[PDB]
Design a protein around this nucleic acid. Structure first.
Lengths: 646, 65, 81, 81, 81
DNA sequence: TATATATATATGTGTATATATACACACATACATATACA
DNA sequence: TATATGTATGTGTGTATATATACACATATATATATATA
């Protein structure tokens, strides 16, 4: 297939945005560096820096330095490789076809001239390369400093640990925050965000300082890059490989998640003074001391960003979006676009990430269709916001569609006179958004959700509204005849009042078998025409994904001829056609248990409502619940105390 | 203070506003002491308001006509 | 929109945030990508650039002579005031 | 040259973003429409609207209507010929 | 070998090839043989086609015409303020 | 050496879209590797 | 010759990381392509 399509796609000689060093692969090839940057704006910065010809006479240049792009985030090899045992008593490490065909890693292997069946123990083998060292010029934010640098280390450890022994993997070290005092001519540089937060909380008057956050390294001005390239070799570091490092590289990037759950409960261990002076003086880094600070701080940050809080039910981004939406639409509830409102909530709520992900978050926070994530959305969406059929992945571009604040629901659920009395998050000194909202209802168990994260999984299925209203009215109201019974049940951790799944806007049916609920769709049969009419799918099943899934099973394709979709915009209507004399073969061949029918076994018409209740708690950290009653009983005292203080 | 404030109707409005704040202070001290916990009827009222707003949003396809 | 945006204090913003401001308050009825490209190129300053006296000061990496200003940063990164 | 014209440059398949009608090229082929739209958000609107099942008995549906995207701006043929 | 703001390109010639350039690339009075060889001049050819107030094209023949059309607007705006 | 094609590049302000990676886990599809045999 | 039985892939959700592409419009320049001259 490649040869059929090579006349239009010839050998790409970009080698992933690679710039040649004038001395790469020659007599002085081991005198050369390879500044592997992360994108293309980073290469713009580095090419600006390596060309200060007489403003930096002691700096580097392209005579001994190259450039290449890491392409975003590196693939890991620890989850995509197999150690297979041969007859002679040796386990050879054979890769995957997906890892073999990764365009970024092929680029650096072709550039550096690496070999997979070599080991590079002797210096006669360590002089057959094309450069002398790989130098990772990455971002200093926690994503780029932790994640992709740890994956690059994990790749080089998993295939050539002897080069991490002998000083081949290097890195720069840039500021993340610079602070400029009025009058003085030297800024204060912080490398970690919590260091700056602990610094800025100590101050009493930050009325004349200008805090600069440098998101990527291409945000650095000309005088700043001049002062960073006058001191280039002053700020390169080198990795040293320990003997305890194999266990840490297996914990953080291995295919077993329970090691990663067991580690990542406790926070990051602070760094001692002897280790600090050793790192800043002899200018080398142990790999284990990197994996237990940077990679662990990243993974805790990703749990914070990707898992909801059990009080308000929303993540960090959706909380910024709700705060910026209350602030934006205050004067009049006039519509905005998606990208204009996204620019607003990135300016005033101090969002420090990209724009495409924020706009996608606003779009999916505004959607409302049968089977969407949110049953009670923050916004009213105006335009094309997608349907059931493509799973809400068929919305408009953000220059077309609009949002608006669902003003009375936001007013009643999140009262304005309560938001003055909440703990807030400070970015760079100023207030941005709360630590959490405390709604009038336990909104964390009232909607849906299914995410991965670092170590843990999140998956919820929403409860009935009436059950939750009955529970909270049994707690609060003293004239309710289930008041003291429910207080006894809170004291002794038992259940009284039911708590069913939400069947709203769902026309199939729910059955509790053993320890789980199952959801069932609805068919309609007619043997006079060999037609089954599907009129309902199970909960949160997209229509076109279901239809393409039923066409790949050739065990089922031997019984049906033609499948036609007659669906509405919000109503399912699917029509199969059977070849003649095949219903009885379905009945005798796809057997019937008392938990599911033969026709439902044939047409994929039930699923399990299986939950993973893993939230984050206030003041940081994972918490893992067992049932929804625990979440309700944890929710109630916060709202009680908030009424007392207002 | 503006010179608009020195008229007789503004004096009258400030007097009745002082009366309304005195009545509200009496209501606040009256419902700080209720059973089971302080602010127990207010949260029932907010339950009722959220429930009818959810009903009125479900009736209008979440468009709030 | 830039005279009105930096009125109170002249703190810099990202290019996409300023673009959202000027598409909101100046009634810009088009796409968002070309507006951000115009905000990027309306702030460049190098030997041989289009504008000799630019409206904005650009803070970040805004391209060079050697690619004709075609190698600036993404609007996610760079800033203007 | 025959293997260059053929083999490598042999027969391909159907194009992207194309939803055929149920009655295309058949016994009632002439009474079917092709609603050619400009992008894919327009096709999302048309898919929303051609599937009003019983809420619009007088409207069209996919029994006699299709969908295809124009890819942005059409190339002109009046000056490449 | 250029810096980020200053050109420095370096060519290397085949041995004993400075002489054969001059008969191949002839020196006119307007440009040298090397500047004919190394593409080192260009013409500054203008198209002074603007739009005017109340819309529509306007087309000038020299920069003096643009200056002389510009001056009265600033004059009357001072009188208005 | 000549007269003559037909395709080819770059600039600003516009119109439309594409794609790689991480993270967890319930579920679906593909063998295949034996173990009685046959 | 059927049976299990332990292997290996494979999309999918939210919140992150880094990129890619077609089209319109005018005019000056260009580098190779072409007759027919012979």
């Amino acid at each position: 297939l490649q040869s059929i399509s090579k006349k239009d796609n010839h050998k790409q000689v970009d080698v992933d945005k690679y710039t040649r060093a004038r001395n790469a692969g020659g007599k002085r090839a081991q005198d050369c560096m390879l500044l592997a940057a992360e994108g293309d704006s980073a290469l713009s910065l580095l090419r600006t820096g390596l060309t200060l010809g007489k403003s930096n006479p002691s700096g580097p240049s392209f005579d001994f330095c190259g450039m290449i792009s890491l392409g975003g985030v590196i693939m890991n090899a620890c989850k995509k490789v197999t150690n297979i045992t041969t007859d002679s008593g040796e386990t050879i490490m054979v890769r995957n076809e997906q890892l073999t065909n990764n365009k970024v890693l092929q680029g650096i292997v072709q550039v550096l001239g690496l070999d997979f069946n070599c080991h590079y123990k002797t210096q006669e083998e360590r002089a057959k390369l094309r450069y002398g060292c790989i130098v990772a010029c990455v971002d200093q934010d926690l994503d780029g400093c932790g994640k992709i640098l740890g994956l690059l280390l994990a790749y080089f450890h998993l295939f050539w640990p002897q080069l991490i022994i002998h000083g081949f993997v290097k890195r720069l070290l840039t500021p993340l925050i610079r602070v400029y005092e009025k009058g003085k001519t030297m800024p204060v540089e912080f490398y970690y965000e919590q260091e700056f937060d602990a610094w800025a909380k100590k101050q009493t008057s930050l009325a004349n300082h200008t805090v600069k956050y440098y998101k990527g390294l291409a945000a650095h001005d000309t005088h700043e890059v001049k002062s960073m390239f006058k001191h280039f070799d002053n700020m390169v570091y080198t990795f040293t490989l320990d003997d305890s490092a194999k266990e840490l590289f297996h914990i953080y990037f291995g295919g077993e998640s329970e090691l990663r759950k067991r580690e990542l409960c406790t926070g990051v261990v602070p760094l001692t003074e002897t280790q600090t002076q050793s790192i800043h003086s002899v200018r080398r880094i142990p790999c284990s001391l990197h994996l237990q600070v940077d990679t662990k701080a990243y993974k805790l940050d990703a749990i914070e960003r990707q898992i909801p809080n059990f009080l308000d039910g929303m993540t960090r981004a959706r909380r910024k979006i709700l705060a910026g939406g209350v602030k934006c639409f205050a004067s009049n509830n006039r519509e905005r676009k998606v990208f204009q409102f996204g620019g607003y909530v990135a300016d005033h709520m101090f969002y420090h990430h990209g724009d495409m992900s924020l706009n996608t978050s606003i779009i999916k926070a505004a959607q409302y269709y049968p089977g969407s994530s949110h049953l009670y959305p923050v916004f009213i969406g105006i335009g094309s916001f997608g349907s059931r059929h493509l799973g809400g992945k068929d919305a408009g571009s953000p220059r077309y569609i609009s949002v608006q604040l669902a003003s009375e629901f936001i007013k009643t659920m999140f009262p304005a006179e309560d938001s003055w009395l909440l703990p807030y998050v400070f970015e760079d000194g100023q207030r941005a958004e709360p630590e959490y909202y405390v709604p009038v209802l336990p909104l964390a168990i009232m909607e849906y959700g299914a995410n991965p994260s670092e170590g843990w999984k999140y998956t919820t299925w929403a409860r009935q509204l009436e059950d939750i209203l009955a529970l909270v009215r049994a707690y609060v109201d003293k004239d309710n005849p289930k008041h003291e019974l429910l207080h006894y049940a809170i004291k002794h951790k038992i259940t009284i009042l039911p708590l069913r799944p939400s069947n709203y806007n769902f026309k199939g049916h729910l059955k509790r078998f053993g320890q789980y609920y199952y959801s069932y769709g609805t068919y309609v049969i007619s043997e006079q025409r060999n037609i089954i009419t599907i009129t309902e799918l199970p909960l949160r099943v997209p229509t076109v994904a279901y239809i393409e899934s039923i066409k790949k099973s050739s065990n089922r394709m031997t019984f049906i001829e033609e499948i036609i979709d007659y669906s509405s915009s919000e109503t399912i209507e699917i029509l199969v056609k059977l070849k003649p004399n095949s219903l009885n073969r379905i009945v005798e061949e796809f057997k019937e248990t008392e938990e599911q029918d033969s026709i439902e076994n044939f047409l994929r018409l039930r699923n399990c409502l299986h939950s993973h209740l893993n939230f984050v708690k206030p003041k940081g950290g994972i918490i893992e619940f067992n049932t929804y009653y625990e979440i309700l009983y944890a929710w109630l005292p916060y709202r009680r105390e908030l009424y007392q203080k207002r | 203070l503006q010179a608009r404030e020195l008229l007789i109707a503004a004096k009258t409005r400030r007097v009745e506003k002082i009366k309304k704040m005195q009545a509200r202070l009496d209501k606040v001290e009256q419902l700080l002491q209720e059973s089971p916990f302080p602010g127990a009827s207010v949260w029932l009222e907010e339950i009722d308001a959220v429930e009818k707003a959810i009903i009125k949003g479900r009736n209008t396809q979440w468009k709030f006509h």
